[PDB]
Each structure stands twice: as structure tokens, then as C-alpha cells.
Amino acid sequence: SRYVLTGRYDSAPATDGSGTALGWTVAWKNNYRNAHSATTWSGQYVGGAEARINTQWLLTSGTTEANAWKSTLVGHDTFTKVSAEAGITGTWYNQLGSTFIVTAGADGALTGTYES
Amino acid sequence: SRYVLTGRYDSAPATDGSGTALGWTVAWKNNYRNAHSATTWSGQYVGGAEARINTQWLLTSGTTEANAWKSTLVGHDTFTKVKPSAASGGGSAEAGITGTWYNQLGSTFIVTAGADGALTGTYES
Amino acid sequence: SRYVLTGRYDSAPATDGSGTALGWTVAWKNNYRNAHSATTWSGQYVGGAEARINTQWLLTSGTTEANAWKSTLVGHDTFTKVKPSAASGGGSAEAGITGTWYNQLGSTFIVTAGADGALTGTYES
Amino acid sequence: SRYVLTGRYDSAPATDGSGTALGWTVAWKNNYRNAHSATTWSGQYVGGAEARINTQWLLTSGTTEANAWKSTLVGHDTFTKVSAEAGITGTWYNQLGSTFIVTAGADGALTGTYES
Numbered sequence: 001s002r003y004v005l006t007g008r009y010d011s012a013p014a015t016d017g018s019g020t021a022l023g024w025t026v027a028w029k030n031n032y033r034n035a036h037s038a039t040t041w042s043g044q045y046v047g048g049a050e051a052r053i054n055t056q057w058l059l060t061s062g063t064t065e066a067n068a069w070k071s072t073l074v075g076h077d078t079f080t081k082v083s084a085e086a087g088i089t090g091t092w093y094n095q096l097g098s099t100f101i102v103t104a105g106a107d108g109a110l111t112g113t114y115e116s
Numbered sequence: 117s118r119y120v121l122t123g124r125y126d127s128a129p130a131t132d133g134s135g136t137a138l139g140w141t142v143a144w145k146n147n148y149r150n151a152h153s154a155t156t157w158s159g160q161y162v163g164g165a166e167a168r169i170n171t172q173w174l175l176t177s178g179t180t181e182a183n184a185w186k187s188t189l190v191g192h193d194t195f196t197k198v199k200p201s202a203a204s205g206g207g208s209a210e211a212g213i214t215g216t217w218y219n220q221l222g223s224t225f226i227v228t229a230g231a232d233g234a235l236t237g238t239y240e241s
Numbered sequence: 242s243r244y245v246l247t248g249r250y251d252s253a254p255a256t257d258g259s260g261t262a263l264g265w266t267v268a269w270k271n272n273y274r275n276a277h278s279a280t281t282w283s284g285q286y287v288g289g290a291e292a293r294i295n296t297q298w299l300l301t302s303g304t305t306e307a308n309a310w311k312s313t314l315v316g317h318d319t320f321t322k323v324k325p326s327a328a329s330g331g332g333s334a335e336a337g338i339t340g341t342w343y344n345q346l347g348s349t350f351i352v353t354a355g356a357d358g359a360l361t362g363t364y365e366s
Numbered sequence: 367s368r369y370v371l372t373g374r375y376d377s378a379p380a381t382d383g384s385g386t387a388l389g390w391t392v393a394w395k396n397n398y399r400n401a402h403s404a405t406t407w408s409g410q411y412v413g414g415a416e417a418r419i420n421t422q423w424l425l426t427s428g429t430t431e432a433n434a435w436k437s438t439l440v441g442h443d444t445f446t447k448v449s450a451e452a453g454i455t456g457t458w459y460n461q462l463g464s465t466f467i468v469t470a471g472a473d474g475a476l477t478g479t480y481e482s
Contacts, residue, residue: 004233008121014152017180021152022176044178044187062135062160069462074440076317247475251395251404259402267374268474270474299408299422
């Protein structure tokens with residue numbers, strides 16, 4: 001139930017109150033499970049008061065190409081956490097109780113694991 | 117105008133005809149520009165005589181909380197893998213995701229796929 | 242700030258407790274302004290003590306060909322149905338789509354629903 | 367297999383060679399079938415000899431609370447044609463073979479039927 005995540009973030013975001021653009025990918029394959037799917041989350045980290053990452057996501061499942069029209073779901077998720085680089089880095093979880101641990105690199109690298 | 121791309125793919129997909137699910141992300145900051153934005157593509161590789169990656173994408177820009185409703189664009193794209201040249205003996209590309217891919221509008225990306233599911237490359241606008 | 246809305250809904254919903262699918266469109270053109278854009282909301286009504294409509298939306302603006310790629314926004318929204326005031330006796334709203342709905346941001350709509358699936362109303366930003 | 371559609375278009379679009387914003391909804395219920403779901407198409411009309419309507423769509427199916435995160439699909443459709451009012455009005459078809467007949471009103475109305 002743990003999967004690899006990888007992404008990128010804007011390592012030098014504007015300072016005017018704007019959020020920090022980011023994204024990441026998870027393919028839903030590990031040593032035990034393979035769902036023949038991948039999700040991508042696109043959003044922004046917003047710091048300050050309490051910290052949050054607001055995303056929209058796309059989940060694509062491998063399909064025959066006569067079923068390709070029904071292959072992609074869309075949704076939104078909001079993550080709360082338990083310098084863009086230090087603010088993103090850590091442990092986050094969502095509404096449904098999924099969890100992800102991220103490390104934000106100085107170069108714009110995002111790396112970690114997503115737990116379902 | 118090259119930027120770092122990174123992603124994941126199903127390295128053990130169905131052999132039933134289904135394509136191979138994948139995703140990747142690009143942040144629009146390199147050594148010389150920063151557009152305070154990132155794009156993620158979600159889709160699948162479909163192989164054969166003419167290998168293609170059919171995608172849907174989301175582009176999010178950094179915004180204030182008040183402009184957050186207009187932070188995210190959505191769209192679609194298809195990438196085709198470059199094939200050997202007729203002068204070399206032509207033919208369809210080697211099976212696999214690793215390679216050079218282009219879209220309709222002139223963007224190109226070069227990618228290396230890992231045996232485990234990793235994807236890393238460079239995207240040129 | 243008031244705009245015409247038109248849409249459709251499933252007037253014979255499932256009864257295993259699923260929601261009621263609907264969708265609607267607002268073109269951002271009225272007497273007073275014109276933003277050369279249209280939004281469609283796709284989502285479901287969930288009846289209940291607190292009646293809600295949960296949507297995802299697409300906002301498209303007219304563009305030239307070279308800018309088509311940046312023409313559509315995507316987002317999501319939840320609307321909640323106005324209920325009677327406590328002074329009137331309170332209680333939850335009577336079932337149905339017909340009524341007044343607000344989002345968290347202060348935008349409001351008034352719709353009338355047809356017995357056979359039609360939706361019509363007025364959207365106010 | 368015919369359904370009622372209705373929508374809106376910008377009835378005074380820009381004059382700069384820009385396309386015309388529009389959108390419509392179909393609920394997949396009729397006298398004969400009911401799939402408990404609705405599609406909305408958002409996009410634009412591009413006029414000319416080989417005129418087209420380019421869209422992105424959202425299909426939402428009625429789900430239980432629990433299932434909600436997986437209720438909505440996204441995709442895209444391109445229609446060809448078999449004054450935006452004079453232009454949109456008519457019969458159109460897309461890749462999948464679906465067809466729609468639509469009347470554009472002077473007011474910005476779209477009404478008609480969709481056949482899938």
C-alpha cells in the first residue's frame with residue numbers, strides 16, 4: 001500500500017502572497033499490487049496560517065483503445081501537513097486519509113512515497 | 117527552453133491490448149526563466165507501428181488565494197515517437213517508452229525509462 | 242452580474258442512495274457585459290438534511306488558434322441549498338433541485354427544475 | 367437513442383478571428399433509456415469552410431457518497447459540420463460517430479438533440 005512518488009515544484013516562487021506551483025506522479029504499481037493506473041496531482045502549496053496543498057488530479061487507467069474515452073478520471077484533493085523548500089518537506093494527509101511523505105530538493109525536485 | 121521532466125509508469129502492464137498508464141510533471145523554471153507554473157500529464161503509451169502517448173494535462177500557476185479559481189488550465193495532447201529514417205532502413209520504433217517524442221505543435225521531449233517505473237528526461241518547448 | 246443558466250438533470254434517479262446527475266451552462270454575456278467565455282458545471286445533487294450539489298467545472302474563453310491551448314480552466318465547486326429560517330419553524334429544505342443555492346464564495350443561483358429534466362435559472366456573481 | 371441538449375453561446379463574440387465560446391449539457395435519460403449520468407461540453411466554435419467545434423467534456427455519473435471521488439470522467443471531442451448564430455446552427459458529428467442537431471438563438475440559446 002506504499003507507492004513511489006515523483007514530482008517537481010517551483011523552487012523560487014514569487015513573494016507576493018502567491019502560492020508555489022507543484023506537481024507529482026504516482027504509478028499504482030508496487031511489489032504486491034498493480035492497478036494498471038497512474039495519478040497526477042497538479043496544485044500549489046500555500047503556507048502561512050495552517051499549511052495546505054491544493055490540487056486537482058487526473059487518474060488514467062490502461063485501456064484498450066476502444067475504451068480510451070472512459071480512461072481518465074478527474075478530481076480534487078486538499079492536503080494538510082502534520083521557505084517553499086522547508087514548508088513542502090514533510091508529512092501530509094488528505095480527506096480520505098491517504099498519506100504522503102515528501103522531500104523537496106533545492107533544485108525543484110520532489111521525491112517520496114504515497115500511502116493508500 | 118529545456119526543462120526537467122519527471123514521472124512514473126506501469127512497468128508491468130496488461131498484455132491484453134490495453135495501453136501503459138503513465139504520468140509526468142514539468143515545473144517551468146530552468147536556469148534562465150521561471151513561469152511560476154507546473155504541468156502534469158496523465159495518459160498512456162500505446163505501442164505498435166506508430167507508437168503514441170495520448171494525454172490529458174493540468175497546468176497550475178502560483179496565485180493568491182483570491183485568484184485560485186483561475187489557477188488551473190486543462191487540456192489534451194498526443195505525442196508520437198520518432199522512428200528511424202528510411203535511409204537507415206526505416207521500420208517502426210523499438211518497443212518502449214525511452215526515446216524522443218514530439219507533439220503536433222512543436223514541443224519535444226527526450227526520456228529515459230527505468231526498469232522499475234521511473235521516468236526522467238528533458239522537455240523542449 | 243445576473244446571467245442566464247440552462248441545463249439538464251436525471252429526473253428518474255437511482256434509489257440505492259446515489260446522487261442525481263445534472264449539469265448546466267452559463268455564458269458570461271448579459272445586458273451589461275461580455276467576457277467571451279462560458280462555464281459548464283457537471284456534478285451531482287445529494288439530497289439530505291443539508292442538500293448539496295457537487296460539481297466540477299470547465300471555463301472556456303474564445304481564443305485565436307495559437308492560444309487555444311490556454312483557453313480552458315478547470316475547477317470544482319460545492320453549492321448548498323437554502324433552507325427555511327428558524328423563525329418560520331426551520332427544518333430542512335423540501336427535496337428537489339428547484340430553489341436557491343449558494344457557494345462558499347458568495348455566488349448564488351436560482352433555478353427552476355422541470356418534471357422531465359429541464360433546468361433553467363439565473364446565476365449571480 | 368436521441369437525447370435533449372441545451373446550452374449557451376456568446377452571441378456577440380470578438381471580431382479578431384477569435385472563436386466563439388459555448389457549452390451544452392445532455393442528461394442521458396429519455397423515454398427509453400436512463401444511464402443516470404450527464405455530460406457537459408465546454409469549448410468553442412471555429413468558423414469557416416471546414417468549421418469545427420472543439421470541446422473538453424465532463425461526464426458525471428450519480429454515485430453514492432463513498433464513490434464520489436470516482437464519479438467524473440474528463441475527455442475531449444471535436445465536431446465537424448455536416449455570424450456565430452448562422453454558423454453553429456445545423457448538424458454536427460464527432461470522431462466516435464455521435465451526432466447533434468442544434469439551433470442557435472439570437473439570445474445566446476442552444477437547444478437540440480444529441481444522438482449517441
